[PDB]
Structure formats: C-alpha cells, structure tokens
Ligand binder design. Structure first.
Ligand SMILES: O=S1(=O)C[C@@H](Cc2ccc(O)c(Br)c2)[C@H](O)[C@@H](NCc2cccc(C3CC3)c2)C1
Length: 377
C-alpha cells in the first residue's frame, strides 16, 4: 500500500522537500519540510511575510496547550514558539491519526524561505536532539507508538521544480534499482554514520579516516549541500580544482558565492571528477561506497541575467560541525532509515542523474580494516 505515498514530496531547488500534512480538528492543511537533520515538529502559528498560511490553534478543538516555551537554533536560521499537542495526519501517507507534539512558531529569524511553499518542519531524527530536551517525544516516535506503522521510513529525493517520495513504514521496491547497502546508525540522536574512506576520481584522499567524521557525520535531508570538515573540505577542493584546471573559475565559486555559467548544453561535466564515499558496512571489515557525479554537487541556478546559459553553484561547502550528507548526496539514491534495525540503507534511485559515460552508484562489498578507528570521540 506504499504506492499511495509515491511522489508525495514536492519543493523548490535548494529550499528543501516537503510533504502535505493536516493538524487539528477540523483538519488544517500545511506543507511541512521533511528534515532528518532535526527532531522537532514545528509549524508557523502566526502571520509572516513568507507564510501564505499558518496553524491556528484557536480553530482547533483537539488542540492542547502545554504551557511551555521552546526554541530551536539551526546551523542557519532559528525560531521560537509555544509547545502543545494536537491530532495530525498525512493525506498521502499512512491512513492513521496520531496526537503529536507541535511547536507553534510565534517568532523566527532566517527560518522561513520566501516562496518555499512550506510553512512548517518535521524533524525525523531522535529525541536526544529535540528541544527543549529529549523528553519532547518526536513525531515519528509518536506515530510508531500510537499505530501499527513499522519503525522505519525511506526517502527518494529527486532533483531536476523538484519532487520525491517519503515511504512511511516501509520500503517500496519499485523506487530503486540494484541492491540496498546498509551502514550502521552509530548513535540514535542525529542519523549518525561513519565514513571510512573517500576517493575522488578513484584516487584516495589518504587522510586519517577520523577526519572524515570530525566531529561527526550525519544524513541530513534538511541540508542542501554536502558539508565537509575544514581539513577534508580543503583537500577535496584542491583535488577537484586540479581535475578541472582546464577551465578557470572565480575563487568565489569554490566558496559557493559565485555561480559559473556555460553555453546552454555545453557544460564540461567530463572535467569534473566523481566523488566516492565509503561507508561502514554491516559485517566485520566490510564497507560499501556511494559515488556522486558532478551533476549532483553542481546545483543548477537561474541565470543572473536574461541569458539562457547553464549556470551552477558549487554545492560542497566547509563545515565546523562535522560532515553533512545533504540533498546533493541523497538525490539520486533511495535512502532507507531503518530505525528498527539501527541502520541506514542506500540504493541507486529510480530517479537518478544521467551522465553520458558515468553513473551514480552504490557498490559493494568492499574490505576496509580498522573501520572502528574512523569514528571520532
Ligand atoms: O543547515 S541546517 O541548519 C537546515 C536545518 C533544517 C532547515 C531549517 C530551516 C530552513 O530554511 C531549511 Br531549508 C532547513 C537542519 O535541521 C540542520 N540539521 C543539523 C542541525 C544543526 C544545528 C542544530 C540542529 C538542531 C537539532 C535541530 C540541527 C542543518
């Protein structure tokens, strides 16, 4: 019965993916951003320039105030509001209704995006990182406890304006090709995993694998880019520059500031290398890899003028909070958040990218010794 959830996600490039939900009685329709990088379910509950609509607690008869404030600071943007509970459902999802915690956003800063089409956020990560504290039961946890929906979900994020699917309670075998490869969830807070090796164009970066996960590595559908720790980022950029030394790009480009352009349909994809991230496997000394094509870390953006040339932005940025595998990584892959078995699965998506002589992939099995030492402590 997962077919009903296929294609239940929409959104704009770089503005996140959202699914339709309803809260309160009678049901109030809202587009909620799907974010595996947080654990708070929050929605606008007051007027805002970027909000076409919002949650009105007054009109909901099933609303319950918790008389307790709350705020959440993201890497970029933040909001604060009032806690409470109410009935929630997902039209294009499982046919159920659960009472979940809801943070009514009353004030925010750089959180809502102008014209994103969503008015809330659904944090699918664990309680450990929920605000104010890990006692605020996350939405998915409530769903699993109050219904018979299996403890897992999968995400198929498709690029291009953008669409995808969020299969709640299972895996839809029609959304991916090949085999699914699983990596352990190291700890249940963020969806933390362990990168044991990195290669660019088949060339190993040869860095202490601890650097790849300093201070952690997470799968964040709520982040657009692939964010890398300072040292790793520098090495990656240096390698990518050399691979594309044929052409010249402004230094601001490698910082995600300036967008490079090329004649409509003349993008030199070949000069850009593929990036391979090896992840910890499910058995001793075993790992697997996911390969990313340039069409993934070169997010396309509208021409800065009236020109009709292909312009893109470097979707790989530096991080100070660990590696972040955002949409640019997830796009083209079918990702299974198998909470019940503490693992995350990856498979080539049915809506993957298309390069002439190259292809995004998930390959295994590989042998990698001392993977344990790759985790940071
Ligand atoms: O770039 S982010 O801030 C986008 C954010 C979700 C978000 C928020 C506002 C937006 O317009 C968009 Br688009 C997306 C994620 O949720 C973050 N996930 C990691 C994280 C980083 C710092 C603090 C937290 C606290 C747990 C929530 C989580 C990464």
């Amino acid at each position: 019965s997962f077919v009903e959830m296929v294609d239940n996600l929409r959104g704009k490039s770089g503005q996140g993916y959202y699914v339709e939900m309803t809260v309160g009685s009678p049901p109030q329709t809202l587009n909620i951003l799907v974010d595996t990088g947080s654990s708070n379910f929050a929605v606008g509950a007051a007027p805002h320039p970027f909000l076409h609509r919002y949650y009105q607690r007054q009109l909901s008869s099933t609303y319950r105030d918790l008389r307790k404030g709350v705020y959440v600071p993201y890497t970029q943007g933040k909001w604060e509001g009032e806690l409470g509970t109410d009935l929630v459902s997902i039209p294009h999802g499982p046919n159920v209704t659960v009472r979940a915690n809801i943070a009514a956003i009353t004030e925010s800063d750089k959180f809502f995006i102008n014209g994103s089409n969503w008015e809330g956020i659904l944090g699918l990560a664990y309680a450990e990182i929920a605000r104010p504290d890990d006692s605020l039961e996350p939405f998915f946890d409530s769903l699993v406890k109050q219904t018979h929906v299996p403890n897992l979900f999968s995400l198929q994020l498709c690029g291009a304006s953008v669409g995808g699917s969020m299969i709640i309670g299972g895996i839809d075998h029609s959304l991916y090709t090949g085999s699914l490869w699983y990596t352990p969830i190291r700890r249940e807070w963020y969806y933390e995993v362990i990168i044991v090796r990195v290669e660019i164009n088949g060339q190993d970066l040869k860095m202490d694998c601890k650097e790849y996960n300093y201070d952690k590595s997470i799968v964040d559908s709520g982040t657009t880019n692939l964010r890398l720790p300072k040292k790793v980022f520098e090495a990656a950029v240096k390698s990518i520059k050399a691979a594309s030394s044929t052409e010249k790009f402004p230094d601001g480009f490698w910082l995600g500031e300036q967008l490079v352009c090329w004649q409509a349909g003349t993008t030199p994809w070949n000069i850009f290398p593929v990036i391979s991230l090896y992840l910890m496997g499910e058995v001793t000394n075993q790992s697997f890899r996911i390969t990313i094509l340039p069409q993934q870390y070169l997010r396309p953006v509208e021409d800065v003028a009236t020109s009709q040339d292909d312009c893109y932005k470097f979707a790989i940025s530096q991080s100070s909070t660990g590696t972040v595998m955002g949409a640019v990584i997830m796009e083209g892959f079918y990702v299974v958040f198998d909470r019940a078995r503490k693992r995350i699965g990856f498979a080539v998506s049915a809506c993957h990218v298309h390069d002439e002589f190259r292809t995004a992939a998930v390959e295994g099995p590989f042998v990698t010794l001392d993977m344990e030492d790759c985790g940071y402590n």
